[PDB]
């Protein structure tokens, strides 16, 4: 929507005028006039939106040439901004310094020319309401959208096929065979496969099972690294092995553990199946593999008897539609007829129902809306096998979307098809692109998360992993939806443009690149940067590669000089040996994510990019030294980093009354313990997530417990993470008193701390803490006896600890929901009192002692009895990773 | 509720531990113990609340005494705090301050005794905790509540009485007669009176209408001065004029203006009517007085033909109850029988029905709850004449009320009965007393506002005036509810005790004053403070008087010495000429409201009190030079004042990296323009309401300090006020560009600005500004021609302007809903284009040109036709000051 670009330009111009006046002093008057006209045309575009746009070419023409003028104004303003900053760099004290000054205010003359063009547009419709405001539709208020709790986990109508396949399993013991699952894309084949892969009988028959995604454009070596990594604790030895040596290692590991079932999803081509099949040992075991392929030919090649997947019936279609739209409630009688008719028209494709239900929940719950959508679906689905019909359905659903969500939904497809998108990354990117403008009181991150939840609720985005606390971790768009979004954003809206090197595709030259606004490179990027490309009007650069691609020492200056107006730079997959001097002139940089392996310092000149919001640094070094003054940066909002980051000691200016209190800051992933001083925590009043990585002894030492004492000050802190790197238990550590931990702390994670289980009482004294995760021997001891306190704890996660005896009563954990017990090889028993917790929903046991498994089974039986006794107790599910335990 | 005391103690203790260790260094261990045992006691009390403590005697005792130890622990800890700060004052640099350290350690011995007493009882609490937890009830989550917009304004089945009354008037012209209104309390007589006082026929016949409240304890001169205040601005002169001569002036003012109606509200005794009737001239005109009384004898004396109020009929009862319970929505069929039975059981007393509706709202909307309510009401309403039936009904409603809200109703009674409680003051009290605890993310004030709105929704608190934008401005408790709340809070929970004295009675002695927690004095207070009283366990002192009482120069230091452990000091109605030293030693002070007339300098030592939230100062001086380092009082949240305060110039400490950035702050009501400086705004990042008073020119002048520019920094500001005191128009003032104003600004007010009507475009450019109030010639000029911009503006308020020609199109004010044209004696007419605005509902035209009023009637007729034309247009209301128009 043009509204988005207009609003972002307005906001950026206002910010420029307020904060830095000198930069805009030369042009400030033209800037202000442009800003007024921008507000006016934002209102104009809103009105034009009120009227049907896709049903009128004249309307689109009207809004057109506002977008072009806006882009020209944007580019002129940015070029002047950078030029004036270079003038400041020149530091020319001369009152009249014509060189570059004539031409810079002549860029201001480009700004004035575009200002005049904006004025001419204003003239064309001085009112802007001459004929358009006369018409307005969809006038209504906006209501609340609610959180996306897990629902309809039951798969409608796929149990019969699942049973058929699970019967197809173990047909001929002592042999390896592949079970083909065939169906048109979007028929739910991967849903059936996932259901089977988690079925209890499947888990019990095969001790080992693996899920592998074989994209249309997979790479074999990554795939084998992925498969092996599950079985091995370390992949270092195999990182230097060849594809075939890797296959042999996989065969060995996989034959170690008896039988096995491997699921290969979306095997596009026969050649891929042939290339991969070698790693599976036909070891004369009753082994199996389940493949999901959209093509009948490859399915026949794999096995002459493919399992043809069935369309859902009309009754099943209606059931799924109602389930999706009304969740746990029931469809009002007046809407039942329309819903059933729609489901009938769907033809039974689960994806079609899942999308139409999204459209319905988007629109509303009145019979008129349902009649309208029924008419639309009748019109658009006359044919059956044409793949464009689902595209038309997606068009229907996407039309109703709010424009702010339309921008985000489009931007989602920038990621390579089949990529698992880190939700936090996606949200920080949205914020960096300005798609989410401050609307109300919610913090930006919270608003973005809400956006993502609405997207998922509509079903326009699929969820892959949920963090322990249940929120979203990684999501991906469906293949057809990904294609739709790619085509839409690339053609209709020109949001971004992809450069995929096919067997024949050759790099577009400078002239085509001049038109692009955002680049995404997901194929060989080193070849692209050997071209020494150039583009002034590319603002964003995205590269979501699979491998990590070193940057040649000669091509490093290609990114800055190639694009000097960059805003979003997502180059995590690209190792940089160092940073050229032209990185310190990308002044329009908001988001900057990259990787490295030899970077030990962030040079102070990085402190000049005054605009940046996010910073991500994935460096292998153990110690990273941030010399760049994060405090000077006025808008820093995130500082993720793996290494231990040593923040610069704050230094209040001797003659300035500026308080360097960054009020926007919201994260500091792994600051070093040595920089948890009082000042650092003074400067981040609104800090919402903190983590430390280093020698936790300095902090937790009482003789030096002033540091976690300092952490007592971040009133808003909600996520604390303590990570110990020192491998020597040079002394014992004691947790300071419970009152020292900020009162809202909801999530704590401990790793290699070696604390006494007698300190669990302190964490019991915390009242809001809701997810506790201790890994790599966070707490040391053989006997632990729960003393209550965890009033609001929801997920308990113990991993790799030498605990032996655990004693607790039902009242120790009133609100426990998820219990994760990994690699506790030395715990004799699990207290049965836990069987008496109502919140206790799902239990997981992994690499644990046999007595623990026995006690867990007693707990399962006990909770089954409790539910059978009529008590409204939520369903219980137990999952021991090794079935034999 | 005990949980409230325990929670407040816990929070205060935790804060003391975190901030100041030296104060607690002596008894840190006992402090932390107390903290733990208090948390456990709070959990125990919650659990006991889950069960019905009243049902079991053992429970009543078990809950009992946990509170006493908590009260005992508070007294000892507070006394230690003050004694230790006194030690700091001594500054005894000796390593062992054996003299008087053994005194503060005597207090510490009290502390340690208390800690041991808590550990005891905690043991006694340990036993039986399981027996308590075995039982629970009302297991449910908490749902959202919604804002209380005006609803059910119409009065059920009362138009018969209204028309009968309006008929009674005009019986005998050229004569003065008073019409009695009789009925039991809460029967709605005031409702009927207000209905009549607003009826269009009444507003047309009598030009001069006056509404007067005559409490049980009125004071004649007070109301006479108020009546005079209606006709002329000031009352200070007549403050030097006798009551009978006041009455003469009232009679003259009233007789000059044609006919007159006056409503005397809630007349109790005959003598009061006799005394007050004097002011009304029987000048041989058709004038009437409408008195409402609960006694038949006074009514009969005033007239042998009293108007008995009628009970509501069963159908009327049910319609009223349904309207209250279900608001606009109709009753669900399954609850109709229960609702009708309940209404029938109320015997037609509107107050009983109203409280029952509140109770039903509190319970929910399930048939079981309605059956339970029906049973209960049948139980408690066997009798009719006994007034205690309504007390039982309010008790029934109260029991279902959350304890946070419960803490109110009872604290609401503290305000003197019949007093109009300023909502903002009430909320800041709430906060200061600690009744409102951080639960979530809403700013404290917002949580208070929602509490108050919920109280109104349950109908327990009746509202009196709303601000222009509609948010509540002034509420009070109904008489029956007030007596119920006062008795309850004084007896059951001992929240506070009133000291008001009867004839032949004496002020309670020091022994009695030793068992008080809060003092409310609403009668002679100078007499009380001439007793030289003394109490150590009084934390709050409230004095909501009528007249401003001075404090004798010899009797000043009674309060600081009478009570040294004060928190709330609400002495707004007591004029202090100076402050004693013993006042500065008060350290437990949160709230401090007081008046004055000669106080020009806020003392420096006043800045030592670390714990203050609010500050109110009604100094008559024009300037109030503040020298208290507000920057150092870390909990400061308001600095209300009326004169032009001058905040101290901030200075970041030379040798401390601690930034003096207050982030709780919310308002700096009336600072001086000289103190609208950069730093003063850097130090208050979260400021949410600013006002200025002084020579607005120095702001609008850029040479002194770009101060209205500096206002740009307060990203959260939402209420601005520019008050100009300079009466000399030295030069014209020009508003800065619209981008300077904070983006969220939602309310602006300009008095004496004398800005040129051309600038109104700048205020048009603002996008959220919702209420513009220009009073006493805000803008100077004679021709105003709207150019648009006020997209979101909702209320327009013009007072005392020389505007002659106003030109506008319907597109300039799309969202307008309220228009106020006060004292526009030079304006000719208002653009009829406003008649086309759908949102336009209410417009008030006071003391303006008759041509403007004719245009107003044209607008009214046009909107009448518009609504008649089938458009879903909201009802329109026209208010015109003089009847002839
Ligand atoms: O600390 P944990 O409870 O073990 O959770 C971590 C943490 O994420 P959260 O604290 O937000 O939950 C890490 O956060 P970052 O390091 O990315 O800031 C994240 O990443 P790492 O793997 O690099 O530690 C990691 O991911 P994973 O689950 O893959 O181990 C995992 O996140 P979740 O708990 O959200 O899944
Ligand atoms: O209700 P108040 O607390 O008395 O304040 C509001 C207004 O501010 P807001 O409109 O933002 O609420 C002014 O602010 P303050 O003076 O209270 O700081 C106030 O000014 P004055 O009291 O000096 O007149 C004015 O007073 P008034 O009610 O007499 O108009 C009154 O106006 P509203 O209640 O209509 O908002
Ligand atoms: N049996 C089913 N019940 C409900 N939804 C289903 C079912 N089968 C498929 N779907 C939905 O159909 C859509 C397409 O399936 P998906 O799992 O995304 O990929 P695939 O088509 O490869 O199976 C998704 O929204 C999926 O949840
Ligand atoms: N139809 C009605 N007639 C009278 N009061 C009504 C009616 N409907 C609701 N009420 C409410 O019942 C109460 C009537 O008594 P009230 O006016 O409070 O007492 P009093 O007349 O003694 O001041 C008010 O709260 C009023 O708003």
Author numbering:
A (entry chain A), B (entry chain E): 1 to 885
What does the paper say about this structure?
Electron microscopy negative-staining indicated that SlNRC2 from this peak contained filaments and aggregates. When concentrated, the SlNRC2 protein from the 200–300 kDa peak also formed filaments with similar morphology to those directly eluted from the void volume. Further analysis was then conducted on a subset of 611,661 particles for the dimer and 159,294 particles for the tetramer, resulting in a cryo-EM density map with resolutions of 2.84 and 3.17 Å, respectively. The cryo-EM structure of the filament was determined following the methods previously described. A total of 280,426 particles with more coherent helical parameters were used for the final 3D refinement process. The resulting cryo-EM reconstruction of the filament sample achieved an overall resolution of 3.6 Å. The SlNRC2 filament consists of three protofilaments. Only marginal contacts mediate the interprotofilament interactions. Both dimeric and tetrameric SlNRC2 structures are present in the filament. Each protofilament contains several copies of tetrameric SlNRC2. Filament propagation probably involves the incorporation of dimeric SlNRC2 into pre-existing filaments.
Unlike most NLRs, the plant NLR required for cell death 2 (NRC2) belongs to a small NLR group characterized by constitutively high expression without self-activation. In this study, we discovered that SlNRC2 forms dimers and tetramers and higher-order oligomers at elevated concentrations. Using cryo-electron microscopy (cryo-EM), we performed structural analyses and found that SlNRC2 adopts an inactive conformation in both the dimeric and oligomeric states. Structural comparison shows that SlNRC2 dimerization and oligomerization act to stabilize the inactive conformation.
